[model samples]
Target: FYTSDEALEAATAPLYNRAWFDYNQRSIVPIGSGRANDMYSPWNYPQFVTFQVTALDENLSGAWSGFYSVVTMANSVINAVETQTQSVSEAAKTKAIAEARLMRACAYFYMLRIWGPVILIEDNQKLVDNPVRPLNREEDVFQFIINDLNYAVDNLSEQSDKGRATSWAAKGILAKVYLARSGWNNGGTRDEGDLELARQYASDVCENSGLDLMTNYEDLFKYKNNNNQESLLAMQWVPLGEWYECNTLLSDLAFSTEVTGGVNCWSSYNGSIDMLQQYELADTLRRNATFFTKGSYYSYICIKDGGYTYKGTASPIKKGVPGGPDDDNDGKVKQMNSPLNTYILRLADVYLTYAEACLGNNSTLSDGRGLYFFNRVRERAKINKKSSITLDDIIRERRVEFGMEYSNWYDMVTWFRYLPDKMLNYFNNQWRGYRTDAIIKDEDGKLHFGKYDTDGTTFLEGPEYYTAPEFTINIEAEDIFLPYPESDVIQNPLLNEPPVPYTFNE
Candidate 1:
């Protein structure tokens, strides 16, 4: 802190890496995707899909610990940086602290969304002074996260090193937070003030940030394009870095051996039939980029042989798989080490967030910037843009746009906060149990609904699409928030006791 700006940056660098690895590698796929019915996983971790998660579920616990781990480091950095005397300029000091606060706010936001009301540990001394503190109110937690991000928004620079927090990142998260909070506690009616702020921030990022979406959806997933212009913020992972520091998505998400070039690959998950059907026939760019439907060809994979072709064996995954070392051009050092920055937020999300904010508390918004940006996403995917945008329109667009990117669950949470019954129905009837195998593979080598039922001459229409069987997941209001880990409760008995109000002044 007493040296150059680079020194302070060094101190804050951990905010991007190992501290958050557990959550990035293990938790997102299950909790973020599986819980939202975006993917089907029966054997791997079905508790989330079936709403059977308990306090003992490892993925749940890992997410808990991982989020706190991020908070812990972020807190330490903010506290120490503010307290230390520095020869660095005030802007440098402010930038470093803002970076740490940005990370802390993100972790707290996730905690608020997932756990509802967990402890807020700003001062590290609380770890020793009072380890058995109670949970903060959800309203207060949202306020706290907003407050941190506001500071970041005011002080952060627009440009920083790649993979670092910038002013745009702070404003982007702030807009998302405001949009989410608009529906909080408002029984089916969103707060106009929050929606207005959401629009203001998101629209600023959209119109003024000078950023644009990547034309090709395929390039967004390539390891070589880690911090492309489209990325507002992403988790910086080191491919050759030590365990827990490097990305392990390739090993965990790469469908099979051939996909991983003979390295260890256990997909352990499948893109659900319901999610697959969400795509229109023309939404191939985003759909193929998300999941490996049969015959999905990607030039980035198997580069030594010019490209990789899916032989239509099984639908594994495509998003996280950057291919083996040969294809990556030295990006993949070994198995499970994907040298790619995992996305935390992208510019396109801001586009949709702005759209949602403008359409706030209304069934339809026409001839507005909201519709403009909403259609921007659709236009990129080569899908038809709507003349008017509604809540269902945003929901459908978001589910497919960010399909397996570990974000659909949070979107569902926001929807539930405002429109409980509608969001609940949306999840309950998502055809949760249907597998990708449910779609019959045809002799023409495509998965179709009537491919098995119809012969060549008996075909009535161009082609029929397979849909999930009628299934309903019994989800209650209480099921929205997961139970606190039993181990954490035992370690700190105050968890079960009546939660005391958090002292923000501390």
Candidate 2:
């Protein structure tokens, strides 16, 4: 248990990158947007769009291992720091343990959202004695997350360092957790008490954190601007490192190696028609920064090639694609080695959480506080501001703000928990398109889309274009929560049993 500040900090360092690598690499996008119908995977990983997931699904297993790995690693640091008594300063130990707990809580948050009831492990030593662990109640699961966040809020220093958890990040995540918890077991309306807590936490981050949205929305995605003030909780990744130590979203999201600096590009993922249709034409600031449409030009990427133009079929994700290895992109971006941090939480999310919390248990809000922050988000995109908003506006705006950046599915899941009827209806009617060529850029650089038809009068559909008709899935109640991975269930049949209450040390 002997250690110094540097050693303890080193123990906590893996919490950001290697511990979260699997989830960040592939599981986040597909599980978040792919299942939420914001992203299209026409051929590969189509099951997410179809809602026909299996326990052995690759992403399912990836997330299962990913989250648990974070939990395990976090516990290692927390346990070590808590046991440290010889060399490290007490204050340093407190900060290190607080940081570890925050990561553990975040991992728990993801596990609960995706798998509903998960086995919450605090002490790894005890887990070794009995491997057949049963799942815990969802109530306990959410409480565990809240408890850890509160601990982090109490112990963490404000604005400690870039890419590290701060008191503001804990509060921001707590605000979101509270907002989602407000609807649990309640009727159509959310609980007043939870909403108030959410509003308070969100307001603290808003008014006290002193962080603002990135002035240029486009800059938020580039490799050159990682860990800006807007990011409250972000994964810190190196530009060039061993596997599981970098942020290479560009490798899988970019449609061409041309943009990835000749990296291994999957080039399959793009914005689905359902998600792309949600964007207003004037919202080009956010839309163009995140996804590449036909004729979209980027001065940042391919500067040596005289800039890059998207000549692809659909809107391949452009959010994390750091262009050629030039000075514009830090001169080090390579295959699966982009110098960018993946945002787990940000200030804009807190802004929306505050707006939503303030609108709690109400049909519509015209209040100044919520409206002010909500409009701030829109004004940054140069879109029209709203005088009044319903829940519809908040969710639609969230979909656009977090379109392909490892968000959306949790928001959908939170909605389903409280408003299953409306969410299921939306799920059943969501448009999943195989082709996104419906949009044609006009001479004025505005995008125009039309439904493809065989009539040859409307946007003509021909064999040359594999313009498959759009489709949606009929989601069932059981489909809301993902199944436990089959390998785990096979090993421990206890996982299949009804969830049991968790044993808290307190």
Candidate 3:
């Protein structure tokens, strides 16, 4: 019915183009009224998106539907490949089919994590229907994801582009699936078997792939090499010079000086003072790699050429300046044009995962190697080898290492499954308190933080200060996850007739 080209063209058509890449990748920019508008922005579009702050609220539509969107597109591809087939090489066709299956599986896995029970459908049979299918048990959904990823890993190439799904990427997701299904499918706790498999996946990528840590931190985020060695999978964006509409800006942050010929724009997402504090006294590399500081921030060189002359020029405080570029009087701040790719998976993550999993098992196979991964990440952060570490140490390393690369919330939730009180208090209290002090230097070069203190020094400031207080905040254990939104249930009757409360305990 359809040739290889026809099937592939149909599948790849909805996936991504130059414009999609730009939009998705730009969506990672930090929040401020500045140039980069995407940072720290809430998952507002999708009603069911889940994350750290979701518990603070009581809905799960944005993340839920967001995941479903990916699944829908992926299912469309699967339909094209399975139902429509004509003249094509078997190997080429199989590889393409495998890729589509992996994408669908990946999307479903994300859905399962956020919402314990979800509807699982392979074919797009209900394409025209508003309500597609009922929710499937988490266990069954995980198996489907595993099967698809296994097929992809078995057929796809190990070394693929950063944007495209590789065998290793599939394996990484597979490892995650195993990890998430630990108490249900695999063995041990979420931190035990799940973490171990997660480590193995990360290790496999490190040992076999050409991907490596970027020597210079700034280079990682630069536009030219957006998909660098360290970037395992990230959305690609290319503005190309067509009325500046083609370039790109983070969807959350909204605007960046680099994308719009030196005009000030606004980003809704603002980095929390607590999350920012984690990077303060910790690894210099982690801090530099993740975000932009006060004065001398760094974006990819291409950004500088695109009207963003200097670092932090588009920050909230620096808007509407006479000289330099990006002079849009949009009333909001612009964030740093972070060149670092929106990372899906990386070598450091693998190393840390290994270290973390070993904590649950005393076996040598999972021994000091986890710590080794921890140290490698810290080593880049300029931390000494002699620093004390343990399972808890590994956890701290993860927080400091990943920070705001979109992993903090998940880390807290998964961790809360076991260490509820410790994590809940830590997140709601000290972490929250720490981030409350996002001090930006004014014209006098004096730092102005939030409610905590007005004139405090920062590591990034002239007189650096560890402003995060070691105070404990009270968080109820029951507040770990939020209730499912009523809107979602009202729209889909297959959902609970009265809707299940977002309850973690039995």
Candidate 4:
């Protein structure tokens, strides 16, 4: 691990650049599916088995694999800096070490949240020798991640690049680890202590750090405002003319013209009706900020029969190509497309995290500190500011504020460890099912929820569509985490048994 100064510094530059572009910036992969925006599609291949709720998909499995790759890479860099380098200034050396530890902590966090039990590989021996170790228990792994991030928080500088890992970022993650580690030690419910630590770290970031809430809220995502203060961390994307479709929104917004020849067009992943309704009139200003506006309301085609109903504008939403070659600049086809950067963690998220943690720790709906953080975000969105909020109220705010950012799953998982039944019903209904549909509409001016293929039915919502009230846990805790890829098992025999499942069997 001991390499000399100049070589160590040079080696880190490329890794830093790659990490920044891949994980710290943003993309408009149409549909806002978070990672590449393609996880929602039908799984037509065996490689995608990890995405199937019943089997999982390659996208998720790939994610699990990719994070490990990042962790390994980060570990290597950290080791080299710690052992081999003897020349760099203490400040620079410390910064490099902090970044490496932060990256590794983040990788562990991803694995912890998504895989239940993750193999803790902190040593070069594990990284070099076996590489694929059997999973450690979820609790043990979470504690390990917390230790790394906390150590990073102690060593990292408070200020660095806006989107780069800093002491605040480490603290933010450490807070999350504490939140995740709730109920792990004593075997009681996972609340109380975890949320307390979450509250403390989030408050630390909010109070001492320089991150600010963007004024327009809209300005944060507009093409003009790249790398603004409100962005705590995001993944950056530059087209480079490669025709790469990794991020759907960016590719479609920029390439829908070339590929489709103006026949079909870019994808528009509409917001949930519930999320849309959460905003009052002021928050409604953001509708135009985030969606395509028509007259008085935002509009998009509702998926009817594997196709959404679009007004006859000659430009319909197409996946791979646009409509006609000559019709390229047509507003009817290109309108309302989101080429905005994929904002990951921002001041808003940290604020909500603070609020929820405080509320949960106090077990009181009137925690002033919690209310302060929650209200700060609300005020930024121009919504009514309340003096206090329940834990449920904080979550509701986060759901509306961060909908489809893929923050939904993380928030749901954190809440699930505590309020299982309450949160589950909310997700199954309010976010994904009947309640969500009662509030949205199609091109025909009729309300709808989600479409179903049964009996060849289409556009089901409102009164007639609410029949046969059957509700099942569409996702179990075990299902929340994808299984490690079979490929990993083949590579690491010790992992043959797979990790233990994460479930609230109560």
Candidate 5:
């Protein structure tokens, strides 16, 4: 397949195509949004809204299959480039191999967060005939991922075409990977060497990547800013294409109403009352950018046939949807198919990571630069800068700054790995469910009375106030790693066996 430059390019394209699986986006976005108590669903989906999932759950199986597909395709490309002689330039061959390795490493890194120990597959030929492979240790998997990303960083070009892997992207991902693994091993004692490595890599990307945050935070979500300066890598989607080719995140989230237009049948999710409390009244800019509220219609919805309407509802996400009123004053909303990109890595995230690395296991920043980078994000949002920063301050800042962008839950888990008791207590203390005034119509045809969740200042009732049994969130030791799909285990019983070492010339 690598016999020519064209063939090499063809082989690498599927890595991007398969990696952007709908299931990956759907599964991660909701889990990342809801699990941190940042989101609420009127129609509760147990796995996402409540964290109650079993091995038989299809979301688990779907996510497992989705990520492995990227790994499998990337493996094929790596094998071809390594073993087969191609008529391509030496530079082209190196670039192709580096791209494949970058993607493969990315898949493994993503899976590691979900399932601690995953099947490490590098050689495609071995798995071609016998698909059974034992899980490797969590540390071993991190080693493999770091090895691949290091090679990619050494070989990949500093800059590439839009929507393609670059050296900065690889370095940024490696920085986050090191930070995540630093919190691993379950004893809450992070490796000092790993902490230094994370800081170095993150600092390298920030200083040398030539990426910067958008002047306005709201501009980061518009379709025009798909691959802007802030974005390191994003899942690029086009409008007016068949399924899987276009972004469906907005349509999936739009509430059911004729005003919303085009088969608006379900308002599956909404901003949680807890999330609303995280922001201060002065933080209206970021608050409006993230959630949909009255008089806060940033993104305009395109009704059928070139007409545009304000999509300000009490409950809708603005990040993944279409343009804000300022962006679409000309009535240019794409309606059914939104073209906004799903950001995988951005410069702001790297900045926060650098700050966190500096504060590893410490109550306050040891260096002034940590406070500088941490406050950079806040300054952009017009919030006051802090003289000093703490780990809890960083966590809260991240929660609101990244709200509705599928980032909070992973941050929660990473912190939990390092500070188990504190994070667990915080999660337990959060309200299990929400309540509000339920509105009803009286016999006189006037508005009547009912109640539900309220604004942050309003007091609410306890879980015992409700009659239905509560779905307890049990974050045990085993829950960190998702169970392998039952069908996968049945097909390859070797998955249940002990760990086996994989050999690679690193």
Candidate 6:
């Protein structure tokens, strides 16, 4: 049934759709960002703020089941393509298989990042038979992901449909997978050779791939610029009122004011003080684009509650801001759904990945190529370009460059092992504020935000309230990989056993 082009495309469509799973929306946006110190959440129901998550947590379960759902769909497509009796063209078959492989590899890549050493089920039959499988070694799982992506890179085109995976997307993701696996695996420490491979793959996307960085960083986030040139892979969404077909990101990121359709609950997550501090005063261009501060002007006018102008506070995020000029709210004043697409990979990510990859086996980048890619992103952000790049420089640059975009936490986790003390000190010393009920309104009825309270001794907090001596960011090595979902363990007892070796296909 999957041999025909129409059938295959339909089969693969679900893989892209799954990217917007509530699991991903919560995991990448609030949970992941909250853990990385880029953003903070007051509720902490998912426990990302506290660096604590249990196997039974709904978000964790969402993540686990959502990723496996993609894997199952991808595997079905791949299996049918490989063994189809129909006389499909070799080219079509290869592309279909490649697409399936890319999605499957992506599913595994995310799983690998979230939970090291997951059950490796490459064969589609395993999805059907439902046999107990032991967890695979981390390195073996990475190898499987790499092998699948390598096939995808070789087979996918440079350009394709708006939301579909292309060769550039595959290479970009492959480069990240390589860079991520280079550090802190049982295979070796700082795999220098893998860094070279990472550089080559990232360079291919930068130089050979016909994609370019969006000239203005803010344009990349605008509702109208959903599938722009910078976007390599994005979760496409429509303003369809039906559940699961639209984006709910704005529900959490938007402000509670009537100006933003008066969404009852807003600012479920806010930018961290540490994240704000990463911005230099001169970085107003990128900083303004990345976040919303008090008095910031937004052209996105909401005609609700007598049509008041929008006021920005430290609480509301601006990246996925709702009610833009071209917003497709369909006349609903308050909506949890928007038509804006979410980015999974972008060319700017490739540029930075290339720069980080070029810093092979060293604290500082020696290759001039590294500095060039690094500066391209910085210069685009209107920041002063650095003459040289260091581990700290790259880390800081990414945290700011990709802030609130669901991009920084993975880098934070990877670097935590590579630069433990630096990361530890930064996490321990950074200002983690207390939580408050709502954005505090000061004298004259204007909302104000300050690091400290009006009284000299009180340190201020966000809209949500918590106990005194505010929450301090604490992270230990054990917190790296999330625990396997408890339901999965109950169904498959083999997950509790020690990881078994995966024999690689020759």
The candidate that wins on lDDT is 2
Write one digit per residue (lDDT tens) for candidate 3, span 1-506.
56765456545534433223322333222211111111233333221121233322332454455456667767766676666677766665666767667767766655554555777766556545657346666667766787788788898787654566678777766665665565442233454556667667766765667666776654554444566666655544323322222223332333354433454555433444444445545354555455445554434223435433333421222111111232221222223232223555655666666565555544223335656666667776676753446656665667666655555555555566555656655655543323333456566543345432344332243224333434333556554444454677667766664222222211
User: Which of the numbered candidates is closest to the native, going by highest TM-score?
Assistant: 2
Better of 5 and 6 by lDDT: 6
Clashing pairs in 6: 435-464, 435-465, 436-463, 436-464, 436-465
lDDT tens string, model 2, 40-102? 777767778778788988888889888998998888887777666466887788888788889
In candidate 5, stretches whose alpha carbon ends up further than 4 angstroms from where it belongs are 1-7, 42-44, 83-87, 240-242, 256-265, 299-314, 323-336, 435-469
- lDDT by residue for model 4 (1-506), tens: 33454556556543433443333222212112322112221212212112233224344445655566567677778787667675476776777777777777776776665556777766666567656556677766676777777668888787765446568777877776777677433433656767778888999988889777888765665444556777765544332322221233433332233333333343333333455555455565454444322222211222122222232211112221222322221222222222334565677778877776666645456647767878888888888887667766776677566644545655555566566666556555542322222234446533334434465334454445432222333644444455556666667776656565323212
Which residue pairs show backbone clashes in model 2? none
lDDT value, residue 232 of candidate 6: 91
RMSD score of candidate 5 (Å):
5.3
Q: What Cα-based lDDT does every candidate model obtain? A: 0.80, 0.82, 0.50, 0.53, 0.69, 0.71
After superposition, candidate 6 runs with Cα above 4 Å error:
2-4, 19-22, 83-88, 186-189, 257-259, 262-265, 301-313, 324-334, 432-474
lDDT of 5: 0.69
On a 0 to 1 TM-score scale, where does candidate 4 land against the true structure?
Answer: 0.73
Query: In candidate 4, what residue range of length 10 has the lowest lDDT sum?
Result: 41-50
Ranking by TM-score: 2, 1, 6, 5, 4, 3
lDDT of 1 by residue, 1-506 (tens): 45777777777777888778889878878888888888876677877877778888888788988999888898888776767646777888888778878888898888777878888888778787878888878888888898889889998989878888889999999999999999987988999999999999999999999999999877888877888999988888877667877887777888777766677877767777678778877787887888887667877777777788776533567888777777764746467777778888999999999999999888899978878999999998988989998888888899988977888898788788888998778777776765533343356544554222244334222223333334445887888878888888888887777655677762
Tens-place lDDT per residue, model 6, 408-502, is 76677667656666666766665554433334345443443444556534646543333223345466667666788898889889888999999
Error of 3 at 156 (Å): 1.0
Off by over 4 Å in 2: 433-438, 443-446, 450-472
Q: Worst ten-residue run, lDDT, model 5?
A: 440-449
Model 1 CA RMSD to the hidden true structure, in angstroms:
3.3
Ordered by lDDT, highest first, the candidates read 2, 1, 6, 5, 4, 3
